[PDB]
Amino acid sequence: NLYYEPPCCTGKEHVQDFSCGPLHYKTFYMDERNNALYVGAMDRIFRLNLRNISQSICERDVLILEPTGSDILNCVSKGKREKVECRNHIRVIQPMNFNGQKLYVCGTNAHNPKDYVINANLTHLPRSQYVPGIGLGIGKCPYDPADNSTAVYVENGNPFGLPALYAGTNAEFTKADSVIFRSDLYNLTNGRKEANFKRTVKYDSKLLDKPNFVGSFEIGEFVYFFFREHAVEYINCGKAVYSRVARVCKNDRGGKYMISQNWATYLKARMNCSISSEFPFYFNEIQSVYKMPTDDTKFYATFTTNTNGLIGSAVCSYDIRDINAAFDGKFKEQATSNSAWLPVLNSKVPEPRPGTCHNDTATLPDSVLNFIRKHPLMDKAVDHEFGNPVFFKRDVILTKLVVDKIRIDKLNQEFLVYFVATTSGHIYKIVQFMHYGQRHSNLVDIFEASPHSEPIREMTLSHKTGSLYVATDHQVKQIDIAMCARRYDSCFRCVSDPYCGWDKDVNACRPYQLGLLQDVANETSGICDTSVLRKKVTSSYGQTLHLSCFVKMPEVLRKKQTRWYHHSTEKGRYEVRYTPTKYIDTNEGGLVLLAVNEGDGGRYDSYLDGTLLCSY
Template sequence: MRTPRAPPPRPAPLLLLLLLGEANGLFPEEPPPLSVAPRDYLNHYPVFVGSGPGRLTPAEGTDDLNIQRVLRVNRTLFIGDRDNLYRVELEPSTTTELRYQRKLTWRSNPSDINVCRMKGKQEGECRNFVKVLLLRDESTLFVCGSNAFNPVCANYSMDTLQPLGDNISGMARCPYDPKHANVALFSEGMLFTATVTDFLAIDAVIYRSLGDRPTLRTVKHDSKWFKEPYFVHAVEWGSHIYFFFREIAMEFNYLEKPRARFLALKVVVSRVARVCKNDVGGSPRVLEKQWTSFLKARLNCSVPGDSHFYFNVLQAVTGVVSLEGRPVVLAVFSTPSNSIPGSAVCAFDMTQVAAVFEGRFREQKSPESIWTPVPEDQVPRPRPGCCAAPGMQYNASSAFPDEILNFVKTHPLMDEAVPSLGHGPWIVRTLMRHRLTRVAVDVGAGPWGNHTVVFLGSEVGTVLKFLIWPNASTAGATGPSVFLEEFETYRADRCGRSSSGEAGRRLLSLELDTASGGLLAAFPRCVVRVPVARCQQYSGCMKNCIGSQDPYCGWAPDGSCIFLSPGTRGTFEQDVSGASTSGLGDCTGEPGERPRGRHARPGTDLAHLLSYGGTDRTAPPVP
């Protein structure tokens, strides 16, 4: 059974009706969080502001940070800044200040700066902003900087930050303008990047370089391949690299008759594209030095109903995680900036993503035609976009017949959209002041590592924490998610107040640091490490601790609410399902008071209450 093609977005008046709940009451309710963390907790969280060994503040006379990228490798954090790269040790996790142990200063040379200024750029733009920061192998960092609009890349020792070899060109590997989005990853020694290749940022490209295979790129200046893309993320899965991005949808443009009026709807849609890792390009006649396997499809994140409500603007995507045995990515979407504000989280099974690329192609036969599916009998064989390999009819992509290569060149778009798991968002938040733009997921939360918690970061650093039930049918009336907590991550006292406006406190990344039980929130001028839970705020009140439904928190016999890291041993209780807190008092008695008859299991050192499918059962003890 084929997944229905996602129709074009609805006009704003209908969106408003949906948001107001007038579409047969199908729009989901949005309950408030079970807990809001007090702001004074924030003052105790460690922060990096450029401080080095032996000093609590940045060296006098240095610029404010302008962080672009962060990369965590085990217990070490690398921070790519403007003109600098920092190495920060994350241990001990109890430290009140994050300081760098090594610092690499990597400035643009005067000639590059002069050329940049001559081309009309401001002095502040003609610096070296670190835009690519990757682990190339177990001891080498691969770093690219914008270098005053003349991008350059280099290898550095992970331990000493000393250069390894000579610099290489950053063209097609790193954007010229630090404001432009880009993604990059290494696979099998090859660098896959998605960025722009020119000073004017009009040539968007997915590019493969380095390694032992030929350099490849997407077709240049072809709106069927790309139309003003904004690259968000890339993942490796199976024999392909998948790129997630948003762009202007060309499939809504056509010449309308009888008025001969060109109908061009500038609609942003979210996409996933893929390429074969072993692609070697086409023949000398068609797609030479270009991808023969590039295909793209729309991502469908919408609230179902008589009229679907679409979240079309992709903001962030996780890596591939395992949920209920499925390879899944979670993605954050929002509505357009000129629409009603709203954000949603949808999950996509990578096997379903791959299945869409085996489905029908979509085409526009003439400028006045609407886009329609390509009949199967008109699709050449072997299937366009497949990965050639030894032992197959064609052992390399360069051996494909011109008929196949021409079809791929003119038909990169799939007809069907990738459906979200459950055919709807797992989380929806509308009419918020700030969009949700970042996501981190913990698929091993709690003492047994059997719960999934999703952290969503807003533009200004407010984090929303949700408990997710991947199999929504087991959650009963609670739905697929529970809004556990809301807390702040931006430390205005250390990271700067409102002098630079909201842009100065824009959340750049949100990464889980499981070893310390924390989140690393990066902003332009600082990195803040915050805990994934604030269990101590419930100490002395069993009802609040149990009622928090937080997999990270448990009630201890001494009347405290304690943090439960994976493998925690000892006596504690929790009720992650939130089945009931009746009989637990109202928190007006003595601190730590425990009502009788609730969750009592004499003779065991683990009294842990969980719920699966609405039925309470005790989880097995930790080995």
Template sequence: MLLLLILSFWGPAVLTSGQVRPLYGTPRKTFTLSSNRGHVFREEGVWNYSTMLLREDIGVLILGAREAIFALDLANITHKKSMVKWEVTPEMRKTCSNKGKNLATECQNYIRILHKMPDGRMYVCGTNAFIPTCDYMSYTDGILALEGKQLDGKGKCPFDPVQRYASELVDGELYSATFMNFLGSEPVVMRSLNDTIRTDFLTSWLNEPIFIGMKHVAEGKENPQGDDDKIYLFFSETAVEYDSYTKLEVSRVARVCKGDVGGQRTLQKKWTSFLKARLDCPLPQTKLPFLMQDVFLFCPGDWTTCVFYGVFTPQMDMSQYSAVCAYRIEDITEVFSEGKFKTLHNENSIPKWVTYHGDVPDPRPGACINNDARQKGFSKSLDLPDKTLQFIKDRPLMDQAVKPPSQQPLLVKKGAAFTCIVVASTTALDGSIHQVMFIGTASGSVLKAVDYNGNMVIIEEVHLFKHSEPVKILRLSTTMGQLYAGSEVAAVQMPLSTCDHYTSCMDCVLARDPYCGWDLISNSCIAINSARPDTHGEVVQSLRDGNATRCPAVESTKTIKLFHPGNMVRLLCQPGSNLARVQWRVNDHPVENSNMYHIQHNTLFILNASDSDTGHYTCTSVESSNGKDYVTKIATYELRLWNIQMDASVQPQVQEQRNTLLALQAVVTILMLVLVALVTWNFYKGHITIARCFNKTEESPRSMSSY
């Protein structure tokens, strides 16, 4: 049964005849946070830096952690401007522990909700030892302060600190997706603060969901049909539409209308516009559907241009792949507005979800109030007929799945699981606009990737956190040109691009970083937005092709290396990138592994070197781009046999080596003399005696036998 289920689920993807994207497994460059001009913030005794609110209007990053909230300078997060503690009382901690929760970890207050209110204050909620509580917070004259309202947070904030949730604040109303009870058995999608409305407690609406993200799309002002704004919810849940012996999870996208106020009789105080559909990120080489872990809304223009970027990881199998899929809002809208519904059908007394082929009431179930509905006399959801409301109550699931436009992921990578994603937009030298993805991983790094017309390039990987702490949250400030990330142990900040990483023209151009280009005048890799328009002709950038033919040749410096006969000689070579391959040559002849030579990690070892091994050794880095090989000479060595009578050009190097050796010998001699003096002094003072040493040796067996 499960096999049939898998084939029915993935059959169309497996049989697709189109091109399947290759696996992009290697970032071109690998950097550390410190080398990337990054900053790290952590406070002693504080953990779980996983909630962020960018306040670009006041120049601070509001960072929520465990029992603490910080206001950090957006330009440099190591500058803590203010901090407020929100701790659990001892009585609450004891009550939480008595309910079976861990006193040290779970019975704390984890800050989970941070939103800016229309009046400039902030709305903040925490788990509060499994009694979710909310409050208002202000930042005035550089001081963070909680108002102490102690508002009920049920349905707004999770009880459990490890439980996934989603929230969005729109026009003073809080939209949230979490659980209503202590046990985590009552999932809810709710609007609160002013006008409360929520989902029904039916498995056909939400079936053991894991909430991922919530996004607001303001289409109401520009929609020609007079449609409403939408709140989109992304989550995974146990599928109700498939028969299997084990639980099968699928990713979903759901949406509700901002103006929804519930029904008059049916669905009172419940959503009348809640619709959901399966969200596919098809990977033909996998058996089970991938599950979404994070989502980012990117809108380069009006609402019709919006794209949702999601990161996906596998379920129930040992696959080590992660993926990024993108979904156009027009495709999601088409499924909800024109697609068929699923309905529960009893077949031989066995309930089964099948495609609904009957009549669909008018107005269409789940639709927002638009111009067409108003012309028919329905100005708000309270006016909708019971027939429409009962239909959507019983059938909130769409039959058709939402798929990416290309029917395949943008990026597939083997390795550490993807955890989160943000997307920035930048303009290249030729005026073209590119979306740059920053993807957090479970190993504590962030990947920077760009799709050039179907050719995905992972520009770099930056290691953010030590000990492979997973990246829990990413936030992007295009105003500051900075990326902010949080983990269990710290928060970090890094620039979106650091062009001076690239030290040569070829390295800069082959990086294909839309933020960077090589300035032929200053002979440096510069930020494109800093280049003057009148000098654009002297700046080299080739993003789609990676064409570095305009780059001038660069000569490597020659190193003279001396060796003694019979010794092993080691010649180092650092390739230009992770994608480059190293080639060694001696006297212009290729070097291969043999009894004489051994190449390991790009380093050449000459075994049992002799007079015949003297000569010129060169290491070149070869990197392919768009079918063309680009060769860079990385290192040049002149290997000479050491002897007393060397020419004057080598003599200074030999003298320097001799001076270094003599200095080391002098240091060792001094240390030995100091050691002898210390031992002699201890014998003289009686601290150490030969008899005492022997006595200890004799007593040791007796002392051991006494245990």
């Protein structure tokens, strides 16, 4: 009996499951104050228990919202399969404050988007009660369930202080239309239409070119959108999908004359996630984006190269000041349909600067309006912090992600732990630290959060309960972000996790307290030299025995050299080289001793990349 780490996480409890059948789950809303996680699904919305999702009943904690038969016949007549496509897949769940806190919901609805307003307890509003501007989600949530959309319900900052839903999706049956859209401005008390809707210019591929959204948030006086689209400026050289960030002013009221339903402050910028060199290596396609609830200045996202050819993913981090810096910089421009994309001199920019917020945007001169009409793309690409990714890996496709922040004050240490999903269903546990003034990282653990054939559709994080939440097509799993005792039974693996520390007095890994052993940055190698598992064993002559450290090698460690050393009194200190018979090497870093004898006995140390793992 050697080192052994139990598998994770498919079958103290740290993994909780919930399932009412293959319901194509999607769309998260986490309310930490009420211990509820609202999860959308096909024709259903659930309200789960945040501390333990297994305590929710499929019948008591649900509110079915299946489409109407009139919309089903329309969808079948189009040519779409009625089994899943002509159903209602929820895509928007946002907090809404109308006569108290309620929920805003939106769904595909058999390729006919329709929104609702429901109470927190998953009960419809009184049928006699009317909802101003609700009933049709024409530009609020997509038609096709597979479409990547985004939205956020903003309360403050809009014109006249009214509420509205900023979103970005299709807004037509065919893929022709694609728009960043704001709903009609309604005063929900009196029900009067106080302002028309805002949307990107129709069929202007310079604004959006076959986009795929991954997230959207409200920060300061703006609303930001993260997505990937076809690179309009790369066309002269080839085909490429670039990642973009788009910014609009909350108080944007539109243009003049006939173009009042179009944005007066819409600007987008390419996002830079490359490796610093004379010839950078860009991860151009974004896959997801996460923001911490308490911090509105940092954004984390997953980027991938084109899924064809050689594949590589990467995680980049961006500051709000760097995003605003791109929107405050020069403007890209293509003079004619045959000109090259060149920057604009500051002398030609009209004032007020296009993109800057302004009460009543119709007051702006025709110069400013028509300038931003044909200059949506900023010349500068958004700079990623430190000029390099936080982590990257070859032949891996990374999707959703969630980031946590840890700080041990008495040692003055701050860590960032990234929980990145892979298309193979695994979650990468990646830590970030500062080693001698520079930023490095190290993949701590890899645990399976779903079978290979079941992708991860959505993922969120709860700092209060300290648990990770992953949604798939078949079920929803709750995973703790720290399983020190249940996972790490070795000092080697325990001291590398910032959540954990190795107690030498109880001989077990457990949550970190001051005084326990930990070295995440590997700045003090050999810390576990005294907590190493050493198992002296004398066996009979001739018979062959197996010396090993781990039962099965941990996933993140299998790609490290396992060098065995042997100190014998007659032979001395030397490194064991493998021979066809006596010295056999195992796939778990073990050492087999075929034909044991007198000269074999001695001190046996098993190093792993120059650091002791176990001894015999």
